[PDB]
Amino acid sequence: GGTKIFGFWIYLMSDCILFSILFATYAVLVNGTAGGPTGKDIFELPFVLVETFLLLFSSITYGMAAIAMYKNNKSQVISWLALTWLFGAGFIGMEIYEFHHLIVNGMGPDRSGFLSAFFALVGTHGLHVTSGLIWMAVLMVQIARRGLTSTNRTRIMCLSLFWHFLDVVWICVFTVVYLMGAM
Amino acid sequence: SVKTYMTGFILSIILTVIPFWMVMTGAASPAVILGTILAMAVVQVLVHLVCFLHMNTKSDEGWNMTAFVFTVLIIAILVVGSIWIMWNLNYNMMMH
Amino acid sequence: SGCNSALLDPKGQIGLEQRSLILTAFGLMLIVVIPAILMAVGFAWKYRASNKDAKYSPNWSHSNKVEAVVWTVPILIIIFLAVLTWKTTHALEPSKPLAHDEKPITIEVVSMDWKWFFIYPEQGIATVNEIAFPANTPVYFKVTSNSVMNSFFIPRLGSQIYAMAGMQTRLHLIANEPGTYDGISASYSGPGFSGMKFKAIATPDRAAFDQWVAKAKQSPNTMSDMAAFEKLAAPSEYNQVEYFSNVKPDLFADVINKFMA
Amino acid sequence: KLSLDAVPFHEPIVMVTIAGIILGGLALVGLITYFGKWTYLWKEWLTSVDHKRLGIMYIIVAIVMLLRGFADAIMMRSQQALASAGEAGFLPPHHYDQIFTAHGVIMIFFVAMPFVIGLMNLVVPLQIGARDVAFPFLNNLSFWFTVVGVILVNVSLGVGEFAQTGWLAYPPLSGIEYSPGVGVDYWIWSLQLSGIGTTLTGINFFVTILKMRAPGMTMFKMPVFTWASLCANVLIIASFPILTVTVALLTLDRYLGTHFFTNDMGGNMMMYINLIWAWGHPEVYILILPVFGVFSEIAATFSRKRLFGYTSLVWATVCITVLSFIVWLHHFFTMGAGANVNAFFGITTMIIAIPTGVKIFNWLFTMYQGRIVFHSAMLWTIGFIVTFSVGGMTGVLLAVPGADFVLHNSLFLIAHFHNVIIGGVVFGCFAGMTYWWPKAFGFKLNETWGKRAFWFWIIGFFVAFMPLYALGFMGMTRRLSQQIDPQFHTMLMIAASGAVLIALGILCLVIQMYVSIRDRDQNRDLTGDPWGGRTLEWATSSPPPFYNFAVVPHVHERDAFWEMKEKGEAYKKPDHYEEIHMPKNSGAGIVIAAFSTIFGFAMIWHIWWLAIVGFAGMIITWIVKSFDEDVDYYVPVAEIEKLENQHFDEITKAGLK
Ligand code: HEO
Ligand SMILES: CCCCCCCC/C=C/CCCCCCCC(=O)OC[C@H](COP(=O)(O)OCCN)OC(=O)CCCCCCC/C=C/CCCCCCCC
Ligand SMILES: CCCCCCCC/C=C\CCCCCCCC(=O)O[C@H](COC(=O)CCCCCCC/C=C/CCCCCCCC)COP(=O)(O)OCCN
Ligand code: HEM
Ligand SMILES: [Cu+2]
C-alpha cells in the first residue's frame, strides 16, 4: 500500500533530476539569443502571474480533495478533483495560448537557442501538467466507478505528490525562466 | 489538514505576489530584486514541501526527507557543475 | 607501452612534461596495484582449499589494524597524486603561454570536413593538412572547427585540444627537436575521420621555416575572400597538402563568426 | 503513407546475409515454439511478474545481444587489422561507423545493463527475504522496454542504419544537418525507451530493498550484493533522467529543428557532452557496483570465510554512489576548460578511486586465511581482481588532466574502459551466471567448460587490449577504420588474435550452457544450498518456488542463512502455512512495449500517423491496466504444502535437520 506512494515519491525525485537538467540547459542557453528576443520583451509577466496562481490554486483544491479523501465523502473528492482539473486545464490552455503567440510569430523553438531551451523547459512542465490532467481524469473516472475503496486512495496520494511537485517545479520555473529574464 | 493547507495558501500567495510586484514595479536595485525573488522562491518551495507534500522527518522511517535531501544535493551538484563548467568553458571559447 | 612511441619519448616540452607526469602517476599506483595483484595470487595459492596447514580462520571480519592501512595507503597515494595533479594541471594546461624567450608563432587551425586548414595570420600563408614551425620556438594554435567537433592532436608534441564550431580554443605547443611529427584528429567527425592526418614539419631553424613559407607563397591559388573557404570546406575525405599564397586579413575570425553570428 | 521508410533497407550490401541469418534463426525459434511449448512461454515467461523469470529473461537478452555486440567487435578488429599495413578492408567508412556505434550501444545498454539488472532481479528479492519486487508489474514492463530497445537496435541493422556518430552521439555530428539519416533516430528512440525501462527498474529495486526487506534484517544486515544493488539503483534514479533529458533534447534538435546543441543559432554543443557524461559516468558505476556485490558474495561464499570489511565495504559503496556525480568532467578534459575545473574534477576522479581500492583489498583479505575453493565463479573473481586493478590503475592515469590532454581519445582510453568493463561487469555477470545458475534452473553449470571459458576470456582479453594500451601510447586514436598506419599493424594484429581468443571463450561459454542443459539430470541441486552459501537466497529450493519463501525468515543477523546453518535452525518444517498474495501475471507489459515498438519505429521513420496511434496505444493500455482490479491472487496453502514438503523431501534425503 504505502510502497506505491514511496515509489512515486522517488520517481518524483527522478523528475526533479530531469527538471534540474532542463534548468541547467536553460541557464546556459538563456544568453543564446541569436539576434532574437532576449526574453525580457516576450515573457509578459502578468500573464505568468495569472498562470502562477492558476496552478497555485490547483494545488490547494487538490489538497482539499485529499483531506476529503481522508474522510469518507466521495462527492466532495469528485468536486474538488473536478475543480483541480479545471484549474489545470486553464493553466495548460494559457500555456498553449502563450506558445500559440510565439510559434505563429517568428519566435518558435527553432528561432534561437534561448527560445529552444525556454520552450523545452516550459513545455516539459506543461507536458507533466497535461499528464497530471489525464491522470486526474482517469482517477476521477475510477473514483466514480469504484469509490475511495483501495488502490484508488493510493492513486489520490500519488497524484497529490505529482501535482504539488508540479507546482513546486513551476515555482522554480516562474522564478528562473520568467521573472529573472525580465530583470 | 484544513489549517495547514490554508496556512500554505496565504503564505504561498504572499510569497508569489511580492516577487512579481518587486520585478514588475522595480522599486529596488537589481541585486536586491534577484536576491529577494530567489529567497522568496526557496521559502515558497519549502512551504509547499512542508505544508502540501506533508514532508516530515519520520515519514516511512525516514527515506522521504532523506531521499529529498539526496535529490536536492544531486540537483545542486548537477546544476552548479553545469553552470560552473559551462561558464569556464564558454569563457575559454571566445576571441578574448 | 612502446618505448619509441609518440607518448613515450615525446619531442615537445609540453609532451616531455606530460610523459614525466604519466610515468610518475603510473609509478605512484604500482606500489598499490602491484601489491593488490600479488596478494590476489599469493593468498589464492597459499590458502587454497587443499593447503590444509594454512591458518584457516573463518569469521574474521573486522580488523581495525588492517582496515586502517587499507584506507590510509590509497589516501596517501591519492593526496600526493592530487597535489601533483593540481600542479601539472595549472602547469600543462592549454592556453598557457608556454613561458619561453621566443615569439610564439600563431597558427590558426580550422578542422574542416575531413581535412585540416592552417592559417598563419602573420605570414599570410594557408595550408591544408600541413604545418611548419621553427625548432624550440613556441607555436600558438587558435583551434576551431568548421563542421563538427574534432581534436587537434600532435601526439609526439603532446597535448590535444577540442576544435568546436564557433569556439576558439588556445593550444600552446613547442618542438624541442626538429623533424616531421604526425598529426591527427582525435575526435571522430565522420566518414573521412580516418583521413584527418596532417604533418608538422618542425623546421630546424627560423631560416628553414622562412623557406617553407616562401614555398607556400609560390602557390598560384590564394585564400582571398570567404567564398573560397566554402569551396575548400566542401566535404572531401583524403586531401593532399595544398598551400595558399595569401589569406584574408581576418579569415579565422570570419570562420568563427559564421556560427557565432 | 509509409513516409520515410521506403524500399531501400540494405540491399546493395552484404548485411542482407546477416539479416537473412537473423530471419532464419527467428523462424527456427518460432517453429520450435510452435511444436512443443508455445502457451507456456506466454503464460509463465513473457508475462511474468516474478523477479526470477524476469531476471532470467534479462540475462538471456543480454547473452543474445552479447553475441551481436561481439560480432560487431570482431568485425571492427578484422577491419582495423586489414587496414593497417594493407589495402582497404571489407568495411567502408560508412558501414564501419555504424559498427562501433552499434557495438557500444548494444554492449552498454543491452548487454551490460540487462545482465546486471537480471542478476539484481534474480538475487536481490531472494537475498532480502522478499517474495517479489515492490512493483511486480513495473518489472515486466521495464524488461519489455529493454526488449523494445533491443528490437529497435536490431531493426536498425536491416531497415536503415544505426548512427555514424559514436555510442554517445556527440551533438554536432549527431545533429540533423550532419547526420540527416535515420541512424541517430534509431539511437535516440532505442536509448530513450531503454532508459525509461531502466529508470523504472531502479525505482522498483530501490523500493524493494528499502521496503520489502524481511523483518529483522536492518540496513547493515543486508547482503553486500543488496547494498551494491541499492547503490546502483540510487544512481539509476539520479542519473538516467539526465539520459532521458539530453537524448530528448537531441530529439527536439533533430525533429522540431530546435537549437539546444546546434552550433549555428545560439545553441551550445558543449552542453550535450556535459549532460551526456554527467549521466555516463554514473551509468558506469551503475554497471560496476552490482558486480562488486556479486564478487563480494562469491568471495565470501567460495572462501568459506566471512566477508572481511562489510562496514567498510558498504561505506565504500555508498561513497562511490555519492562521489560519482562530481566526477563527470573527467570525460572531456580536452574540451578546453580552465585548469581549475579540470584539476577539481581530476582530483575528484582520483578520490573516487580510494573506495574501489578499499573494496578490492577487502575482497583480498576475505581470501586471506580462507578455504578458497577454485570454482569457476572464484576463478572469475580472481581474474576480476587482477584485471580490474590494472584497468582502474590506467583509469586514474587518464584521471590526471595533464595526461588526459594527451591520452583522451587514444586506444589507451579504449583499453581502460574495456579493461574495467570486461574484467568488472563481464566477469561479474559470468560469475553470477555460474554462481546463481543452481538458484535459477535446478542444475549446475558444467565446471569443466566454465574454467575453460574463463581461461580463454582472460588470456584473450590480456592479448586483445594490452596491445591497445601500446597503441594508445603510440598515438592511435579511437575510431580509425581506413588507412590506419603501418606502425600500428603489429599491435592491431595481436589485438585481432586476442579478439579471436575471446570469441573462443564466448563459444566455450555457449558450450557450457549446452553441455549443462544436456546434463541437467546428471547433476542437480537437491538441497537448494550448493557451494556452501552464506546469504538468504540458498535457504530456498534450487528452482525456488514462485513465492520463493513461505516464512519470510527472521534473519536478525548479518549473514542470516550462514548463522542458521551454524546454529542448526536452518531447515525447519515451519508448520502452519498462511495464504500469501502473489501478483497475477499480466501481459499488459508486452502490449505497452509493443506499441512502444510501434511508437519508436514510427518516430525513427517519419510515419507520424503510426506514431500517433503508437503513442496513444501505450497510454490507453496504461489506462486500461489501471482499471484492472484483479492484480493479485492468493496461492492456496495446499500448494505451499506440496512445494515445501517436496523441498524438504530432498533436504531430508541428504543431511537435513
Ligand atoms: C563500469 C566500467 C568502468 C569503471 C568501473 C570505470 C572506472 C574508472 N574509470 Fe572509466 N570506468 C569504466 C568504464 C568507462 N570509463 C570510461 C572513461 C573513463 C575516462 C575518460 C577519459 C577521457 O574521456 O578522455 C577516465 C579518466 C576514466 C577513469 C576511470 C577511473 C579513474 C575509474 C576508477 O573508478 C577505477 C577505480 C579502480 C582502481 C583505481 C583500481 C583498484 C584500486 C586499487 C588497487 C587501489 C586504489 C588506490 C590507488 C589507485 C592510489 N574512465 C568510459 C568511456 C570511454 C569513452 O567512450 O570515452 C567507460 C565506458
Ligand atoms: C493522443 C494523446 C496525446 C497526449 C499528448 C500530451 C501528453 C500526455 C501524456 C500522458 C502520459 C500518461 C499519463 C498518466 C496516465 C495513466 C495514469 C494511471 O494509470 O494512474 C494510475 C497509476 C497507477 O496506479 P496503481 O494503483 O499502481 O495502478 C495499478 C494498476 N495498474 O498511478 C501512478 O502512480 C502512475 C503515475 C504516472 C505518472 C506519469 C508521469 C508522466 C511524465 C511525463 C514526462 C514528459 C517529459 C517531456 C517529454 C514528453 C514527450 C515529448
Ligand atoms: C513520447 C516520448 C518517449 C517516451 C514514450 C513512453 C512514455 C511513457 C509510457 C508509459 C511508461 C510508464 C508505464 C507505467 C505503468 C504502470 C506502473 C505502475 O503503476 O506500476 C505498479 C506500481 O505502481 C506505481 O505507481 C509504481 C511506482 C511509482 C512509479 C511512478 C512512475 C511510473 C512511470 C511514469 C512514466 C515515466 C516516463 C515518463 C516520460 C519520460 C520522458 C520520456 C506496479 O506494481 P503492481 O503492484 O504490480 O501494480 C498493479 C499492476 N496491475
Ligand atoms: C569482449 C569483447 C569486446 C571486444 C573485442 C571489443 C572491441 C571493441 C573495439 C575494437 C572497439 C572499437 C575501438 C575503436 O576503434 O575506437 C570497441 C569500442 C567500444 N566498446 Fe567494445 N569490445 C568488447 C566488449 C565490450 C563490452 C563488454 C562493452 C561494454 C559493455 C563495450 C563497449 C564499447 C564501447 C562503449 C565502445 C566505444 C563505442 C564508440 O566509440 O562509439 N565493448 N570495442
Ligand atoms: Cu566518468
Numbering used by the authors:
A (entry chain C): 22 to 204
B (entry chain D): 14 to 109
C (entry chain B): 23 to 283
D (entry chain A): 4 to 660
Paper text:
HCOs are terminal respiratory enzymes present in all three domains of life: bacteria, archaea, and eukaryotes. HCOs receive electrons from the respiratory chain and reduce molecular oxygen to water. This exergonic reaction is coupled with proton pumping across the membrane, which contributes to maintaining the proton motive force that is further used for ATP production. HCOs are multi-subunit complexes, and their constitution varies among species; however, subunit I is a catalytic subunit common in all HCOs.
